Specification:
Blueprint lengths: L29
Amino acid sequence: RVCPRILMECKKDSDCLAECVCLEHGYCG
């Protein structure tokens, strides 16, 4: 669950850092 909250758009899970994931709204979370 290592995922600091950082408002950023994402195209896929890899676009985000740490174990964060890309939700449907198109942002990491």
